[PDB]
Amino acid sequence: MNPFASLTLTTLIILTIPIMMSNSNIYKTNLYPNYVKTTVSYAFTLSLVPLLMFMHTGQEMIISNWHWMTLQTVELSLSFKMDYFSVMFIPVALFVTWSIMEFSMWYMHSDPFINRFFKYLVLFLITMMILVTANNLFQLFIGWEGVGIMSFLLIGWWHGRTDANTAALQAILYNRIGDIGFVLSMAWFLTHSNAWDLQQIFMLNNECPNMPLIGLLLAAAGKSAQFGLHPWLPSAMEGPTPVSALLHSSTMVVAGVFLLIRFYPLMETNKLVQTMTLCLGAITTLFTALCAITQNDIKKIVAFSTSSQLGLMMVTIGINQPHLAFLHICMHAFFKAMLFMCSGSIIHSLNDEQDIRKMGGLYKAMPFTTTALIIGSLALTGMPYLTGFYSKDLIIEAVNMSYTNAWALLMTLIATSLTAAYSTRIIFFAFLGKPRFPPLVLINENNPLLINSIKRLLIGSIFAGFIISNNIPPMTVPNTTMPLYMKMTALIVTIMGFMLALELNNTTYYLKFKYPSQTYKFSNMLGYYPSIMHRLPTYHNLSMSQKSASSLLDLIWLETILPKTTSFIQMKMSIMVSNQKGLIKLYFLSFLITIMISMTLFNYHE
Amino acid sequence: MLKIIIPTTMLLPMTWMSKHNMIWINATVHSLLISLISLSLLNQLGENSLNFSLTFFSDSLSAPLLVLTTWLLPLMLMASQSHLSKETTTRKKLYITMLILLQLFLIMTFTATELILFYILFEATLVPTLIIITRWGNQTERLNAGLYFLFYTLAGSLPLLVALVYIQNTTGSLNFLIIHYWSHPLSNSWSNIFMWLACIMAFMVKMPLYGLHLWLPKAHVEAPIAGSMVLAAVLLKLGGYGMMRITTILNPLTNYMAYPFLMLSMWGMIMTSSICLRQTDLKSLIAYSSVSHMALVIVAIMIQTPWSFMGATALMIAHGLTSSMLFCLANTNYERVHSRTMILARGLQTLLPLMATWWLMASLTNLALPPSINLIGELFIITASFSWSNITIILMGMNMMITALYSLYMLITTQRGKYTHHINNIKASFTRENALMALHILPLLLLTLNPKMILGPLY
Amino acid sequence: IRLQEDPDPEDENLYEKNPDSHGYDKDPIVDLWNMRVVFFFGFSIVLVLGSTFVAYLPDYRMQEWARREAERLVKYREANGLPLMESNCFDPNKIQLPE
């Protein structure tokens, strides 16, 4: 019982302190952002200590704190799982959040509600560590929507903008469809396995979790923005650049993938579902990357590159490689977040313009950002002996050296080449070209907040994988006997992806007749996916609510069957009874009949 | 219970004899004081319910619901001294007379030890309510609304009355305890089926019911704000409370003759939630939203599962507190814009920052995100439904879709977006409005720490 | 003149007369006390004092007692060798089966 118990849990409660102090409203309402950042900085330094504790020995621990509920046989209690997955991801999540917080002080240094913004970031940050550190599935649920809802406000930061509300609403919907599988998964485990803690779920062998894992797969797909539900991530670009730089880059969108890593010991047994994640993983890599290259917004292109990445680890999830997928999260976290505020550095400096058509020549004009961008681009390509190499090439090497689906391999290989392809487009259009911005140039990065924030992630990205891979204990079996021509293909495929993409991109220099290729017309318009999903079903369900449902069913038919028909029947009969003639001759004639029927026909006499 | 019933009555002579302008202040403070006294019933033994006397007894179901009523009475009183201070003292005093009487019937109904005793005041709540909608309502269609509400619940109450007295003539007393201990398996004979319908339709017509939900848009939208909370927060639970109390002499006929009602409620909530997604009136959207949640409660009771009841009680009280708070939200705009169309007053976050926040966590609580007991309510029902049938989740979760879209859609349309140009009446939120709304959400969050109290008799 | 009626009275602003108006009552001093007394008899006396009341009641639903009562039964039951929980609660020996 070493301080490992206290240290990890202190990191969570320390993160709550800025929120608790903010609730006073007598708080540091002038320099709140600096107060928040230094708190995360303290927790980052503190959260290192549990790492080396696990690093030295491997002490994974369960902290079953205050007992909440005693549902019959089910005991719901706040419990944190200090697994290897939780124990090291917290420093990484704290590292990126610290890095951007300094950038957030620079980028939105003029927002009148900047203090409220920094409060939201901690609220999102808090919900994430709840998601990462969660034993019972209820806590996993707590962090799930808690992350999900916090994305809504942050995306709708500029609530005056109409489109931001649409994207914010769109993000909730696509994430909500994910929770259908999550809720389904919870119900099955509480019924069959009769618990929600990971301990019982793994012990109570559920090695035939066909529907539960399908629910788990659907939960990951919605949150991590795979195929089927991608387009909310590209539309999530409408929020502030820091919100894009942290949540949707490598902290919020990972949550869907991270669930599969947690449930790996039960996920591996079922062969059908792990082929489904190969199915979803392969298509997600292509379509996101395929739409990536033909885009123009810097934030869109970068985001599409992320959604291509989230396609990767689930491909690795299927073929008994969860830990490499989880390791892939770490390395992807560093450079992918980095690529955002470097683009954020360009965006704010060059008068908040996101169209790649309006930069060029920023290589010698923006030295540090140009260095940071190309470092991230090289890392993003798995180029050797860097952050990307220690994850991506091992992934591409492992995916081929296994009994998998053939069509998935062709897609992952093509995606990696396309992954480098749009990376050249970013460097070619944004930096290596003649300047195209408005005349009055204000580009500058000399602000220390911008320099230090990017530099920290720079020196992180250079080594990162080297330290982590050499340090974490062996947890899988690295295959060794394997021929050369798919050993080199981890780097071969991206060499062309650099090569012909450069040739096709520089072809714009030549004065040539312009012609929209049909495949480009398909790719550039997000593969036509929003124009059908976001228009056809949305129109039908809304129209069904008006024509049917509200009008036809509720207040036209349901209101006329029971209520109105009875009222009409009573009205007609009330007319019959009340409408008399006041004639004694007719009244007494009725009496005679009644006397006759009673004495003869009613048969009362007999 | 006499420690609550007598004090609740005692406000009526006091309010009728208080000073001219001290009516609201004096009534509110003792009304809060009574709710403090009613907090005493939260304790429940691990066994038989607290039976104070033959006249009154409280269980782990009545007590959480009872405190909701007593905690509610300050909320209508504190929500009504703005749209009634322009009326004479006597009519204002009469308004308190209805509200106090409305509570007294609710307190006695939820604590009735005899089934027929339950029936009288449970039905007798109509008279104080029917006055509220028809007298102090603020629209023309309120009169047709009053007829719609009164007749629709009376059409089911009478068959229950004939059913209850029939059980008296066949099984003796209908005391809740002796009924539970003296249980006879109901045969599948045709008469028992019709007896089953009589003992059930009275309560099932009362929450909403898909097909029998037409009175909520008439009543709730047209009712005065003080009343409008009650038609959605507590009396819908009267139709609820009856269900778990009466579904102990109907087993196992409820096992079979429940598919038409279960089928109507499951598909119905998807329809009525879809109504919310395409509604025009702010109050109607809230009222129809209450239909979907209440239909979820209807589904929950009809499986007779420990988990189902366990989340059933939590859902009702969680929904009741929320629906009241949202009806406070509709009132806040209603005083300023003097209209109920949603798109008339968009852009309130820029003008009213805190009122936008109050609209925020109110929407999330209706969103039923964890750990808010709305989630612990719905999620428990999902598992009970899932164990009953695996296809339920397809219908179960699809409701979570619609309840997500329209909840933020009501938020996004009103709060966010550009402020309405032509309005110049929106003033700073009165401290009454903000304080009232805090007294709604804060106990709702405070209940999240220990939902063991609200879980219900099955726990 | 159609009918003998008055025009719609213009809505009055409580802030217009007294900027310190809380929206509770029109008359200032009682309005100020209305805030003071629906708060005082609100959060502190009910929300705060009721919470610590409802947070520290005696054992509800006999939870703690049941667990400790259960634990001793396990300790006896493991020592013998028979299963930790009988599948027949009511003793079959004092049970009659109609042939």
Binding site: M571, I575, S578, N579 | G137 | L3, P9
Partner: peptide
């Protein structure tokens, strides 16, 4: 203000019968 019945609402009650009919229309 709270809406109140008007003469058109009153004249609806003002007929010889609540529910008009050509027999009672005179």
């Amino acid at each position: 203000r709270q809406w109140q019945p008007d003469v058109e609402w009153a004249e609806q009650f003002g007929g010889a019968v609540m529910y008009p009919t050509k027999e009672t229309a005179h």
